[PDB]
């Protein structure tokens, strides 16, 4: 019944919030809908895989909050394998490469590719991380989809195709589904195009030894019986002196404050008294999560390494069920595995199939891409379709369709009386990621500490010292990358010389 | 506790479903979240207005189901005033006109306007009403917004501005918010551009004497204590022999079948056991409702009629809080009033203001557009911001953002075990309207009758005889309207 703060949701954000509050001496309760904590993180354990992350998994440089929290919990990271060559598979052919990005040889195509990424980052610099709706061209950019932006910027199909895959992979949505302003904000607040996408020096550099689910689990261990599992919140009443929070199994909790640490749209599952203010009421119907099946195919050995492939495949084309893979082999070199994402519309399309049918399709794809018959001999398979989850709504995160972020973005983390808002979606750095979950959980907790008069206003948002274990190299450009013209730029230079 | 069918939602669709089932001899219970029935319809009564529709109000030709149901309930309609001239107000100036549509004089502009509406209807003919995702170009049209389509088709700013207002008014959303495929389907399934937008011979021809709220109210009267008010459904369990439906006030209902007669996204307010199938689970997060404040300003007299204006104003431009009005005066000629809609982003923008501030802005706008100081002297004001409604989500209806209808549209009315889906959103004719609410409620009820073996499969979908009281005139085109070239067409001919 009675406590200081009810935290709705026991994912990383809710758990990080509860831990901060608990450490500060408050009585906290975590109400978790599922029979488990972790939410969009889920580490499955069995003898065949030992452990496997079926949800969020990767951490990297500049994600200092999750790294600190995980380290404090006694967790270690290891590096995702990127020793050997990456593969870019396009028009039925594999092109192995080193360095972070697929090489482009055609001079015009090179100009187009260079300009596109540059322009994405250029536009991003005009977008405040904490207020994307304040960008000078916010309305213009919000009123077009990423598809329209690609159509305008990409003068080659090659660039347009790679850019599309980039969007699909980053936010598990189609280019036509998402606002350009939102996507540009999303990339920028993850440190830019290079940082968001890279393995070495980027968001995918590392995984936790033992799985990411240990973050939430070990916090639950610390909190003990303060975490209530199988307590979906159905009702929040703020009409009386103390906030009343009711669960589906007919329990009532009474608190001074509430943190909502659930995906924004899942706020819809709660009936509010009094009703939410108009802007939030409508916002939570406007913010879907993306669509993904995360699939892990196990093999006797990491055979791709013998062919000087690290296991990273960037796979273009409608026929390919999986557009991106990473080596998921354990740091010890055993439980050899390829992790692949079935993205956006393909998650919808292929969900109809059986698990065995999806396995077959993946193996046949990998055999082609790796040029290896061994890919047809899996020893085990695990998958998770996040679209089916009632208490997630999707993965990885919430996307904003055209027009929504400028109209409703302001209210995402605006408190509603005594309800404060956590969740990765409310983060200003690495939103959509485990890192953002930590930032948002701890910020929301500190908003409550400030409301209680326990800390000053300037302590609500707190900077994080850089990890000593995972230092960040800066993202650099060359002179040529900076100043090479776009395709229309080159054409204007031709026009002026001809005239 | 125990009944044959639980209907979730006591709007027109839920009520029409419950009435059909009740009339067939089944024991029905209606679980309604609010302390009233009617949902997106709401008729307020007081001495100042007598009655006023603050939600859905208008009915017209080809809406034969709502007309039949209302007539059976003892309701009558009257005609919205369109005797005198309509006004098109653009770039700060009022252009009175007769006939249904604002005249365009510039030849190039005329060609562009003519082509646009014609193209909208041409495209709609390729969109199956019962399966828009089966349109030949479904993906192409679904993957662009209405803004992109208008940008492609409209060679004049004049056409683009009127087309934008048309979209804003029809679906209370911005052109950039909505899928082109969905919007083209929406218009087509209301009988086309002329039918959806027209007062005389269209969707806005008539209102119910006494208010539209009477449809739901009178069905509640028939059903008596079978209607449970202030029973928001929170939980549906289909794991056992009978379906279990739980409400917020801790009541449990047990039924053979359930009809969900709530806006699709409001399905999110219910926790499901077992979980919903993946496609519906995600669909109900992808389908918002539009944004509108419906405002009615009352005057001593319908003074605009004296200036030979009917009260219809089509008002372009960002500064105007209200883009569209109709005369809301009673058939008797008293309680003179102008009904206006504050649409889409303007509903969001102006919601910050006080009721009094909104009244002032509307009166000043109407004074300008009507060229009448009398507009500055209101005697009363009523308004409703549908964006604030927990158990509606918005008005008038659900819109589909780009990419959604083709990917998820199939599951909108697909049964989930013993749950069948009503609500205007699931209609195939006049979806988004009170007519669609009736169609969907009666169809969902008949799906359950068929599942019980009471009626054959071919009786699930039932045709409706035309109203004798509100007959439909056909929508016609002229030879020139049909064959005049577009702007690019004229350029190719040059
Ligand atoms: C799913 C997923 C996947 C598959 C993958 C991934 C992911 C995911 N991600 C994301 C993450 O995970 C997230 O962000 C997190 O986790 C979040 O957190 P939060 O905020 O906390 O949330 P959640 O988890 O959801 O939680 C919540 C909770 O609550 C609950 N509930 C609900 N409702 C309710 C409740 N309770 C009570 N009551 C009520 N009513 C639930 O149950 C839960 O528990 C990620 N992230 C990171 O960081 N990393 C990673 O890795 C991940 N993953 C991904 C990724 C991807 N990546 C890719 C590759 C390449 C690239 C990319 C991207 C970009 C660029 C490049
Ligand atoms: C709001 C509105 C307005 C302002 C206006 C209008 C409208 C609206 N509309 C629409 C209508 O109203 C609709 O459609 C109907 O009503 C619907 O129905 P239904 O389907 O049945 O639905 P609702 O109502 O919503 O109901 C539901 C119910 O449920 C309940 N819930 C929820 N949740 C829950 C519950 N319960 C239990 N549990 C749970 N959880 C609720 O509460 C409710 O009750 C319309 N329509 C028609 O027809 N008419 C009219 O007039 C209308 N309005 C509008 C219109 C406009 N118009 C415009 C002018 C010119 C033009 C236009 C358009 C187009 C073209 C042209």
CA distance A139 to A153: 18
Whether A248 and B271 lie within 8 Å, measured CB to CB: yes
Locus of tokens 């940008």: B151
Q: Whose CA is nearest to atom 6 of ligand 2?
A: B56
Q: CA torsion sign, A156 to A161 to A164 to A165?
A: negative
What are the helix and strand counts (H, E) for chain A?
16, 21
Domains of chain B: residue spans and CATH: 1-39+61-76+209-287+401-461 (3.50.50.60), 40-60+77-105+198-208+288-400 (3.90.660.10), 106-197 (1.10.405.10)
Cross-chain CB nearest to A265 (options B266, B285, B291): B285
CA distance B327 to B306: 13
Whether B393 and A281 lie within 8 Å, measured CB to CB: yes
Backbone angles phi, psi at B357, to 5 degrees: -65, -40
Q: Is A174 within 8 Å of A28 (Cβ atoms)? A: no
Helix (H/G/I), strand (E/B), else coil: B296:
strand
Instruction: Quickly list H helices, B189-260.
Output: 193-197, 213-223
Whether B390 and A345 lie within 8 Å, measured CB to CB: no
Cross-chain CB nearest to B388 (options A275, A387, A393): A275
The residues facing A253 across adjacent strands are A245
Choose among A90, A134, A112: nearest CA to A315.
A90
Check pocket membership of A31 for ligand 1, CB cut-off 6 A: yes
Check pocket membership of A41 for ligand 1, CB cut-off 6 A: yes
Q: How does DSSP classify residue A334?
A: -
User: How many CB atoms sit inside 10 A of residue A459's CB?
Assistant: 11
Burial of A249 (0-12, 13-18, 19+ CB in 10 A): exposed
Whether B402 and A402 lie within 8 Å, measured CB to CB: yes
Joined tokens for residue B109: 């502009």
Check pocket membership of B431 for ligand 2, CB cut-off 6 A: no
Q: Which contacts of A317-324 are long-range, i.e. CB under 8 A and separated by 24 or more positions? A: A317/A89, A317/A90, A317/A91, A317/A92, A320/A89, A320/A365, A321/A346, A321/A350, A321/A358, A321/A361, A321/A362, A321/A365, A322/A295, A322/A362, A322/A365, A323/A165, A323/A168, A323/A169, A324/A165, A324/A169
Angle, to 10 degrees, between the axis of helix A180-188 and the axis of helix A146-153? Answer: 80
CA distance A470 to A304: 27
Structure determined via: X-ray
Q: Cα distance from B154 to chain A (closest Cα, Å)?
A: 17
Q: Is A305 within 8 Å of A84 (Cβ atoms)? A: yes
Distances (CA, A) of B274 to A387, A464, B239, B243, B416: 15, 42, 7, 11, 10
Kind and range of the H or E element at B340? strand B337-343
Choose among B176, B173, B344, B167: nearest CA to A144.
B176
Output b/e per residue, B114-135; b: 16+ Cβ within 10 A.
bbbbbbbbebbeebeeeebbeb
Q: Please state whether the peptide bond connecting residue B274 to the residue before it is cis, i.e. omega within 30 degrees of 0.
A: yes
CA distance B23 to B20: 5
Q: How does DSSP classify residue A428?
A: S
- Any residues with CB less than 8 A from the CB of A341 and at least 6 apart, and which? A169, A172, A292, A293, A294, A295, A322, A323, A324, A325
Q: Please state whether the peptide bond connecting residue B306 to the residue before it is cis, i.e. omega within 30 degrees of 0.
A: no
CA dihedral B408, B410, B413, B415 (to 10 degrees): -100
CA distance A250 to B247: 12
The residues facing B247 across adjacent strands are B233
Q: Is A325 within 8 Å of A338 (Cβ atoms)? A: yes
Query: Quick one: resolution in A?
Result: 2.0
Joined tokens for residue A309: 């492939």
Check pocket membership of B28 for ligand 2, CB cut-off 6 A: no
Choose among B270, B246, B225, B289: nearest CA to B421.
B270
Backbone angles phi, psi at A101, to 5 degrees: -125, 145
Choose among B284, B143, B346, B9: nearest CA to A285.
B284
Q: Is A133 within 8 Å of A279 (Cβ atoms)? A: no
The DSSP code sequence of A117-171 is HHHHHHHHTTS-TT-GGGSTTHHHHHTSBHHHHHHHH-SSHHHHHHHHHHHHHHH
Cα(A463) to ligand 2 centroid in Å equals: 48
Joined tokens for residue B261: 């007669």
Cα B295 from chain centroid? Answer: 16
Distances (CA, A) of B57 to B410, B440, B473: 29, 18, 21
CA distance A375 to B53: 66
CA distance A20 to A30: 13
A445: left (phi over 0), alpha (psi -120 to 50) or beta: alpha
Q: Is B322 within 8 Å of B315 (Cβ atoms)? A: yes
Whether B291 and A275 lie within 8 Å, measured CB to CB: no
Instruction: Quickly list H helices, B126-207.
Output: 138-142, 146-153, 157-171, 180-188, 193-197
Q: Whose CA is nearest to atom 64 of ligand 2?
A: B170
Breaks in chain B (C–N > 2.5 Å) following residue:
none
Where in B209-305 does DSSP place strands (E)?
A: 227-228, 233-237, 243-247, 252-255, 257-260, 271-273, 292-298
Chain A residues lying within 8 Å of B289, measured CB to CB = 282, 285
Chain B residues lying within 8 Å of A181, measured CB to CB = none
Rounded (5°) CA angle A17-A21-A22: 110
Cα(A424) to ligand 1 centroid in Å equals: 8
Breaks in chain A (C–N > 2.5 Å) following residue:
none
CA distance A440 to A453: 20
The residues facing A325 across adjacent strands are A313, A340
**Which of the listed residues B100, B102, B434, B439 should we mutate to test ligand 2's pocket, taking the one with most ligand atoms within 8 A of CB?**
B434
Chain A residues lying within 8 Å of B144, measured CB to CB = 147, 176
Joined tokens for residue A280: 């939030």
Whether A282 and B265 lie within 8 Å, measured CB to CB: no
Q: Whose CA is nearest to atom 7 of ligand 1?
A: A56
Atom of ligand 1 nearest to the CA of A436: 14
The pairing of strands B28-31 and B227-228 is: parallel
Choose among B440, B449, B451: nearest CA to B416.
B451
Cα B300 from chain centroid? Answer: 30
Joined tokens for residue A470: 């995972």
Cross-chain CB nearest to B235 (options A144, A147, A248): A248
Locus of tokens 């794991």: B239
Cα(B40) to ligand 2 centroid in Å equals: 3
- Any residues with CB less than 8 A from the CB of B452 and at least 6 apart, and which? B256, B257
CA distance A440 to A168: 25
Q: CA torsion sign, A176 to A182 to A185 to A186?
A: negative
Helix (H/G/I), strand (E/B), else coil: A286:
coil
Cα(A40) to ligand 1 centroid in Å equals: 3
The DSSP code sequence of B175-194 is TTTSBHHHHHHHHHTTTSHH
CA distance A140 to A148: 12
Both ends of chain A: CA-CA distance in Å? 80
The pairing of strands B58-59 and B206-208 is: antiparallel
């Amino acid at each position: 019944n009675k406590c200081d703060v009810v935290v709705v949701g026991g994912g990383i954000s809710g758990m990080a919030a509860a831990k901060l509050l608990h450490d500060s001496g408050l009585n906290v309760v975590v109400l978790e809908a599922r029979d488990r904590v972790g939410g969009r993180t889920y580490t499955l354990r069995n003898q065949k895989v030992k452990y496997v992350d079926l949800g969020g998994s990767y951490v990297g440089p500049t994600q200092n909050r999750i790294l600190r929290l995980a380290k404090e919990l006694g967790l270690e990271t290891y590096k995702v394998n990127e020793v050997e060559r990456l593969i870019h598979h396009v028009k039925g052919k594999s092109y192995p490469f080193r360095g972070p990005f697929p090489p482009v040889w055609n001079p015009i195509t090179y100009l187009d590719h260079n300009n596109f990424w540059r322009t994405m980052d250029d536009m991003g610099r005009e977008i405040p991380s904490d207020a994307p709706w304040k960008a000078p061209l916010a309305e213009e950019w919000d009123n077009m989809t990423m598809k329209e932006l690609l159509d305008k910027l990409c003068w080659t199909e090659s660039a347009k195709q790679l850019a599309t895959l980039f969007v699909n992979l980053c936010v598990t949505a189609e280019t036509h589904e998402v606002s350009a302003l939102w996507f540009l904000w999303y990339v920028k607040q993850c440190g830019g195009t290079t940082r968001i996408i890279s393995t070495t020096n980027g968001g995918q550099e590392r995984k936790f030894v033992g799985g990411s689910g240990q973050v939430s689990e070990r916090i639950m261990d610390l909190l003990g019986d303060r975490v209530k599992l199988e307590r979906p919140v159905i009702y929040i009443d703020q009409t009386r002196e103390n906030v009343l929070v009711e669960t589906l199994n007919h329990e009532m909790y009474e608190a001074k404050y509430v943190i909502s640490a659930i995906p924004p749209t899942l706020g819809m599952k709660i009936h509010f008294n009094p009703p939410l203010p108009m802007m939030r009421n409508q916002m939570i119907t406007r913010v879907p999560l993306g669509s993904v099946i995360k699939c892990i195919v196990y093999y006797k050995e990491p055979f791709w390494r013998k062919k000087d492939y690290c296991g990273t495949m960037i796979i273009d084309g409608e026929e390919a069920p999986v557009a991106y893979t990473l080596d998921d082999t354990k740091p010890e070199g055993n439980y050899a595995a390829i992790m692949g994402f079935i993205l956006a519309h393909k998650a919808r399309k292929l969900a109809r199939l059986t698990k065995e049918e999806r396995l077959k399709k993946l193996c046949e794809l990998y055999a082609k891409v790796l040029g290896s018959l061994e890919a047809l001999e899996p020893v085990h398979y695990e998958e998770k379709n996040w679209c089916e989850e009632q208490y997630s709504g999707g993965c990885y995160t919430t996307y904003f369709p055209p027009g929504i972020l400028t109209q409703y973005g302001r209210v995402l983390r605006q408190p509603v009386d005594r309800i404060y808002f956590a969740g990765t979606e409310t983060a200003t750095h690495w939103s959509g990621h485990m890192e953002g979950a930590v930032e948002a959980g701890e910020r929301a907790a500190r908003e409550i500490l400030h409301a209680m008069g326990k800390i000053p206003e300037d302590e609500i948002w707190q900077s994080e010292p850089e990890s000593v274990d995972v230092p960040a190299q800066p993202i650099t450009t060359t002179f040529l990358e900076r100043h090479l013209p776009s395709v229309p730029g080159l054409l204007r230079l031709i026009g002026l010389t001809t005239i």
